[PDB]
Structure 1
Amino acid sequence: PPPVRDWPALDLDGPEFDPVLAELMREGPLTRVRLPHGEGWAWLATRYDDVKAITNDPRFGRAEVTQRQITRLAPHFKPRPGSLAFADQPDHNRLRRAVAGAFTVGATKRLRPRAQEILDGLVDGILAEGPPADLVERVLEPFPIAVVSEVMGVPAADRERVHSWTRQIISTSGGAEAAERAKRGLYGWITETVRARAGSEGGDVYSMLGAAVGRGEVGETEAVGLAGPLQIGGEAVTHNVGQMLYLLLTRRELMARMRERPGARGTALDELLRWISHRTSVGLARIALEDVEVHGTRIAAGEPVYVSYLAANRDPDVFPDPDRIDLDRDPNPHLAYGNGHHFCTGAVLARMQTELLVDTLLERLPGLRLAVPAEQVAWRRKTMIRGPRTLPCTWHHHH
């Protein structure tokens, strides 16, 4: 059995691959890791084939994780009922069916025009005020929240209440207790919002959810846990695109390639998704439910195991010269959105936003460049999702 390896919290103000994770990928297909918080250790799968398998093995469950204190990145661990993340079948399917209809390909295309308008409105503002602008604050953070709220069904006077609260995603750390305070507000709002609508119609997430509760399909108590993650989910788009833009802004050649292929950025965006280190650590582990062996290692029942989609996305057997951003790849089967039944609920929605963002920013901010040296951009620390805290930019305004 392999020796327990410590995996400290990453402190790197850049998009570079975590050297600690690299050192693990080369130690073997499976390694035991100990994260900053929680108890003990857990197995870690680095091979694409192994990740894709475990991620799809009925023998590994998520529900059990809620019953323990598996080594994790954060010190705070309080699972909620209704969580898609911690849902095993048949509950997972039950829960998702109540909201899935709002995130389908069709719903997303229907939504695109409204999203473009919301995005153009945000871009109008910075163009009107003039050059100096922090794109994270003025575009990457508010755009997703506005679109998701649209999908969720937030009224109008509630928009600012929900946005402000959601800001509990923090810009790194503006408190902690203030984070639990804000959720005590947002979650109470979700519960009440859902209580009402309990019988109403509309493809609306909160509407549909409230309707599903009135029929005892996804009973109350499960509302917050099921919907919270969705309402806050936009943060992933904010930081993943912040990273994409950072690369475009610090590696001029990438910006150039991007600018030369309007209407054909599909492979470029998927290559950035494959290469970008989206998270600072591993997400939620899965629990062995019946003593299994993987890629030559034996995992005893009850033992936890994390998969690394990042490491997987760099597997030399699936992606030749994995550390190079060559864009245009063959199909490119990266696992940026996960795999299995826990595949990202908002993948399609997140993609539509990403494409709008990149297309609209490149066309509407002529001569876009960082307004400060990249070295001056600090990154999010002590949190799951990685990315630039700010992105000070400037662009052509006038003679």
Structure 2
Amino acid sequence: ETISQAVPPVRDWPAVDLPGSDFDPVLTELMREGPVTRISLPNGEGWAWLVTRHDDVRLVTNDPRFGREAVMDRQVTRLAPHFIPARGAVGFLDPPDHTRLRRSVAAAFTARGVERVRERSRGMLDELVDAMLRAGPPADLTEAVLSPFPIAVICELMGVPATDRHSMHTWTQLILSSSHGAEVSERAKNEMNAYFSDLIGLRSDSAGEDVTSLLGAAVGRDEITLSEAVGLAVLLQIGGEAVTNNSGQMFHLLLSRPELAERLRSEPEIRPRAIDELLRWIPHRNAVGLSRIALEDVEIKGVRIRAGDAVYVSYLAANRDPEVFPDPDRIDFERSPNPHVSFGFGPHYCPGGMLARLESELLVDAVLDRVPGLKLAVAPEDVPFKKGALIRGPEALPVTWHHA
């Protein structure tokens, strides 16, 4: 042989505030380099591998050779200045115990299960929209509806009293407050852990359809421990708010490209498919989330991922796979196979996938059908987006409509 340098150089991938829904140029680069790359994020230590292809992302995330529990044994390079989920949360559990914990609340998150809160949710959404209209045109869609709605729906499903909604949002906010290197988020986590630990105990260990009752009944029959239950209850509540940000990009885009909004207004039946196309395209987060550790050597596209090596997958990059999604950057409401991985893949796939689809469904409906001539009150570029955050999205969405 000769002089083989088949190992990709560690690419520095600093935290950078992107505008609107533009694609990360660095991620663009990582994708062109090769199937397997190496990156260095703002925090933690080391380099961790990076997979971007649709097929390799499905492999890594659904293969027993890559685990999550081991990820805590080291300070894997990352984007967030501290691990959000505790040492017992779903995100860090592997198939054996992970499957058990997720089964306890499965019934509430399937299409049929979520379909049970459709009417209830529709009514809540309608009150918020009615309130927006009554107030008057110059409105911030995020504060007026995209923020309150998802919060009300998850709390309702979880069994959280409507009077405690403000607290969930405050805690979620602080917990995801992203950076420094300490306990504003830690205290916030203990407070919310304490909140759900008590709710799970407060007779919610008897009978009821809400998730906390399911978790309480499960804890009562030794199916899952209280730690696992609180850990899951906490991440569901938090993930619940992920819709605000995603739907924010959805609307910023629909009103940004009038031809997309018009197709949805004049052709309602295609809304489901369009929403899935929008979910595939929308760059939901910054960089990547929680890595996996190779539990044993594994060869991928010529690269040897040594046991002990951290591996990252980019669902955003995967949803932009040319071979799987021809003309990737184009938002086509038709799109044939469209097997996007915006909700993850493998055992850790998002349990809120169907709920979010339902929420997105009602939002598009209510917003496009009840607000005549809804449009941005400012130029697309003048809309501010979240800075230094994990999940990308509008900070506010100024819009106006016919009325005034």
When residues 75 and 164 of structure 1 are mapped into structure 2, their CA distance, relative to the original with a 3 A threshold, is: closer
Map of 1:118 onto structure 2:
124
Q: Answer yes or no: is 1:42 the counterpart of 2:61.
A: no
- The Cα shift of 1:217 comes to 1.9
Q: Distance in 2 between matches of 1:170 and 1:393?
A: 27
Map of 1:375 onto structure 2:
381
Contact 1:122–1:139 (8 Å) recurs in 2: yes
Q: Distance in 2 between matches of 1:47 and 1:18?
A: 16
Contact 1:169–1:235 (8 Å) recurs in 2: no
When residues 296 and 308 of structure 1 are mapped into structure 2, their CA distance, relative to the original with a 3 A threshold, is: same
Q: Between 66-75 and 212-221, report the one with greater CA deviation.
A: 212-221
TM-score (norm 1): 0.95
Query: What SS does the corresponding residue of 1:120 show, helix, strand or coil?
Result: helix
Query: What SS does the corresponding residue of 2:218 show, helix, strand or coil?
Result: helix
Contact 2:254–2:261 (8 Å) recurs in 1: yes
Q: Between 275-284 and 182-191, report the one with greater CA deviation.
A: 182-191
When residues 236 and 118 of structure 1 are mapped into structure 2, their CA distance, relative to the original with a 3 A threshold, is: same
Aligned positions of 1:40-189 closer than 5 A: 40-77=46-83, 79-168=85-174, 178-189=184-195
Map of 2:400 onto structure 1:
394
Aligned residues: 398
Q: What is the identity, as a one-letter code, of the residue corresponding to 2:132?
A: I
Q: What is the identity, as a one-letter code, of the residue corresponding to 1:343?
A: Y
Query: What SS does the corresponding residue of 1:293 show, helix, strand or coil?
Result: strand
- The Cα shift of 1:352 comes to 0.3
Deviations 1:140-193 (A, max 9, x none): 111001000011001343334334433436688999854444333222111111
When residues 77 and 109 of structure 1 are mapped into structure 2, their CA distance, relative to the original with a 3 A threshold, is: closer
The correspondence for 1:352, drawn from 341, 355, 358, is 358
Map of 1:9 onto structure 2:
15
Q: Distance in 1 between matches of 2:179 and 2:152?
A: 22
Q: Distance in 2 between matches of 1:82 and 1:106?
A: 29
Q: Answer yes or no: is 1:288 the counterpart of 2:298.
A: no
When residues 173 and 61 of structure 1 are mapped into structure 2, their CA distance, relative to the original with a 3 A threshold, is: closer
The correspondence for 1:325, drawn from 327, 331, 343, is 331
Contact 2:89–2:228 (8 Å) recurs in 1: yes
Q: Distance in 2 between matches of 1:3 and 1:159?
A: 47
Q: What is the identity, as a one-letter code, of the residue corresponding to 2:126?
A: D
When residues 173 and 357 of structure 1 are mapped into structure 2, their CA distance, relative to the original with a 3 A threshold, is: farther
Contact 2:48–2:310 (8 Å) recurs in 1: yes
Contact 1:13–1:377 (8 Å) recurs in 2: no
Q: Distance in 2 between matches of 1:128 and 1:75?
A: 42
Q: Distance in 2 between matches of 1:141 and 1:119?
A: 11
Contact 1:172–1:381 (8 Å) recurs in 2: no
Deviations 1:87-116 (A, max 9, x none): 102111111112222112112111100010
Q: Distance in 2 between matches of 1:47 and 1:377?
A: 32
Q: What is the identity, as a one-letter code, of the residue corresponding to 1:392?
A: P
Contact 1:80–1:224 (8 Å) recurs in 2: no
Contact 2:175–2:188 (8 Å) recurs in 1: no
Aligned positions of 1:164-313 closer than 5 A: 164-168=170-174, 178-197=184-203, 199-313=205-319
- The Cα shift of 1:79 comes to 4.0
When residues 72 and 174 of structure 1 are mapped into structure 2, their CA distance, relative to the original with a 3 A threshold, is: closer
Q: Between 51-60 and 79-88, report the one with greater CA deviation.
A: 79-88
When residues 355 and 79 of structure 1 are mapped into structure 2, their CA distance, relative to the original with a 3 A threshold, is: closer
Q: Between 51-60 and 220-229, report the one with greater CA deviation.
A: 220-229
Unaligned runs of 5+ in 2: 1-6
Contact 1:60–1:286 (8 Å) recurs in 2: yes
Q: Distance in 2 between matches of 1:190 and 1:160?
A: 15
When residues 173 and 132 of structure 1 are mapped into structure 2, their CA distance, relative to the original with a 3 A threshold, is: farther
Q: Between 215-224 and 29-38, report the one with greater CA deviation.
A: 215-224
Map of 2:3 onto structure 1:
none
- The Cα shift of 1:53 comes to 1.1
Unaligned runs of 5+ in 1: none
Query: What SS does the corresponding residue of 1:287 show, helix, strand or coil?
Result: strand
When residues 77 and 173 of structure 1 are mapped into structure 2, their CA distance, relative to the original with a 3 A threshold, is: closer
Q: Distance in 1 between matches of 2:374 and 2:180?
A: 29
Q: Distance in 2 between matches of 1:158 and 1:11?
A: 32
Query: What SS does the corresponding residue of 1:44 show, helix, strand or coil?
Result: strand
Q: Distance in 1 between matches of 2:162 and 2:57?
A: 42
Query: What SS does the corresponding residue of 2:308 show, helix, strand or coil?
Result: coil
Q: What is the identity, as a one-letter code, of the residue corresponding to 2:332?
A: D
Root-mean-square deviation (CA, aligned residues, Å) is 1.9
Dislocated runs of 4+, deviation >6 Å: 169-176
Q: Between 11-20 and 22-31, report the one with greater CA deviation.
A: 11-20
Q: What is the identity, as a one-letter code, of the residue corresponding to 1:267?
A: R
